[PDB]
Amino acid sequence: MVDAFLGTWKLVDSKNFDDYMKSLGVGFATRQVASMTKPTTIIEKNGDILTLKTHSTFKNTEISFKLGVEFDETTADDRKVKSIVTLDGGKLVHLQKWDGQETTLVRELIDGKLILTLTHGTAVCTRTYEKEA
Numbered sequence: 001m002v003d004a005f006l007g008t009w010k011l012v013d014s015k016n017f018d019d020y021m022k023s024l025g026v027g028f029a030t031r032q033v034a035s036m037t038k039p040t041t042i043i044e045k046n047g048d049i050l051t052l053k054t055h056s057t058f059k060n061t062e063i064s065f066k067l068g069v070e071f072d073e074t075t076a077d078d079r080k081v082k083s084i085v086t087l088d089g090g091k092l093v094h095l096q097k098w099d100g101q102e103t104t105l106v107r108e109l110i111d112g113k114l115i116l117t118l119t120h121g122t123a124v125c126t127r128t129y130e131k132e133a
């Protein structure tokens with residue numbers, strides 16, 4: 001049951017995103033622009049296929065996947081990763097693997113807001129999105 005995640009979401013708070021980007025090896029100029037962007041995330045379904053768009057003034061991304069089925073992904077910072085997205089405890093958990101590394105992108109609904117927790121290494125970033133009508 002992915003349905004309450006679906007829709008258009010706007011970033012309204014971000015904590016420790018620079019730490020997360022730095023842990024991934026993102027260069028300073030890119031972190032600097034990304035620290036001031038507020039993306040829009042769009043999550044849509046068609047049958048078993050989810051599509052997750054991230055739009056901004058800086059980078060855009062789009063992925064499509066089936067829950068529980070691995071897919072190739074090229075991230076906004078140009079990592080080529082092996083990904084899987086699954087529901088776990090009602091949370092949408094996206095795991096990326098590359099070069100023996102991993103990062104998790106966990107989305108949880110709290111009081112109607114979409115909380116995205118990004119973990120790589122020891123860095124833990126929390127970014128809050130609010131629904132657009």
Ligand SMILES: CCCCCCCCCCCC(=O)O
Nearest residue numbers: 021026034054059076077127
């Ligand atoms: C230009 C962005 C560079 C850093 C990308 C890091 C990996 C994706 C982070 C996604 C964050 C979000 O969806 O709010």
